[PDB]
Structure formats: structure tokens, C-alpha cells
Amino acid sequence: MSQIFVVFSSDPEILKEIVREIKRQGVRVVLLYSDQDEKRRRERLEEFEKQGVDVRTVEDKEDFRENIREIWERYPQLDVVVIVTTDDKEWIKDFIEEAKERGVEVFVVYNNKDDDRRKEAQQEFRSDGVDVRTVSDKEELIEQVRRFVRKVGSLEHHHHHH
Numbered sequence: 001m002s003q004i005f006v007v008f009s010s011d012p013e014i015l016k017e018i019v020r021e022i023k024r025q026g027v028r029v030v031l032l033y034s035d036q037d038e039k040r041r042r043e044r045l046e047e048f049e050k051q052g053v054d055v056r057t058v059e060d061k062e063d064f065r066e067n068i069r070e071i072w073e074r075y076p077q078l079d080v081v082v083i084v085t086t087d088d089k090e091w092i093k094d095f096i097e098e099a100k101e102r103g104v105e106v107f108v109v110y111n112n113k114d115d116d117r118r119k120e121a122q123q124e125f126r127s128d129g130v131d132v133r134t135v136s137d138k139e140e141l142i143e144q145v146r147r148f149v150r151k152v153g154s155l156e157h158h159h160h161h162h
Contacts, residue, residue: 001105001156003129004071005148006082006095007141008110012044014138015083019053021142025149028080031055032067035085054080065094072102079152081145087112089121096130105129105158109144111136131161 009015015031022029031053035041045055056067064084071080084091087110099106108131112118118134126132135141151157 002078002103003105003107003152003156003158004078004080004082004099005107005109005145006084007145008084008087008092008108009141010085010087011111011138012085014111014141015085016047017138018081018083018142018145019048019051021145022081022149023052025146025153027149028075029053030071030080030082032058032064032082032084034058034064058084061090061094064091065098068095068098072098072104078104081148089124092121092125096125096127099130100127105131107131107133107144107148107158109133109135109141111138111141131158133161 007018019029019031031048033041033045033055035044041057048055056070058064058067071082092108092110096106106129113136115134115136122132122134133144147160151160
């Protein structure tokens with residue numbers, strides 16, 4: 001029943017397009033922003049703050065998983081789309097672990113062109129309630145996000161993955 005949507009992307013220009021769509025659908029967006037400089041980090045995510053976005057800053061893998069606990073403690077409604085600035089399998093992992101401990105279903109959508117290693121990643125992470133979606137484009141990812149709002153905005157409607 002309870003599903004949460006999460007996106008992993010290395011491209012900030014793709015990330016921004018995902019965020020605006022989420023806002024178009026009248027949905028909340030939890031951006032977990034990771035950058036190599038503190039000053040840069042703020043100047044980057046501030047563009048989202050001023051656009052009405054829920055941005056948390058992350059530096060490490062362990063710092064990532066704790067900001068996820070923020071979400072579980074903030075929004076039981078789960079009408080939130082979480083976005084993380086990376087394509088690392090570690091960061092994909094921690095989100096799944098924390099989620100399983102709360103007994104929630106997670107639909108993961110991440111962008112990375114080499115789908116070959118995505119095949120093993122799917123077999124590795126795809127759990128009972130945790131779904132794995134792989135795309136090599138911006139709009140291919142946008143579709144999954146839009147379809148999310150359309151599935152949760154009425155029922156559970158998990159079955160649609162394609």
C-alpha cells in the first residue's frame with residue numbers, strides 16, 4: 001500500500017526538470033543535495049529553496065541515510081518525491097535499507113546510460129516492495145515521476161512499472 005518515489009541522477013540539469021514537474025503535479029520534493037564545496041553547494045540548492053523545494057544537504061553515505069529518516073519522521077503521507085544528486089549504488093542501497101526497516105515500498109528510478117550494469121543492479125536491489133527502474137534519458141525518467149503522481153493520486157496502483 002504505502003509507496004515512496006526516489007530518483008538518483010548525476011546531471012543537475014535533469015534533476016531540476018524532475019523537480020519542476022513534481023511541483024507541476026502539486027507534489028512535494030525532498031532534494032538530498034551532495035556537492036564537493038560548501039559555498040557552491042548552497043548557491044546551487046538555493047535555486048530550489050526559492051522555488052519551494054524541501055532540500056536537505058548530504059556529505060557522506062551515512063549522512064545520506066540519516067536525512068532519509070528525516071522524511072520518515074516528517075511525512076507519513078508519503079506524497080513526496082525524493083531526489084539525490086548521484087548515481088552511486090551505495091546511495092541507492094542505504095535508501096532501500098532504511099525503507100525496509102519502516103516497512104514501506106520504494107520505487108527507485110535512476111538514470112545511467114550503461115544499462116548492462118543496470119541489469120545486475122536490478123537483480124541485486126529489486127526487493128518485494130522495492131522496485132527498480134532504469135533510464136538513459138531525462139524525459140524517460142520524467143515519465144516514471146508523472147505516472148507516480150497518477151498512481152498514488154487515486155489508489156496504490158503499483159502494478160504499472162513500464
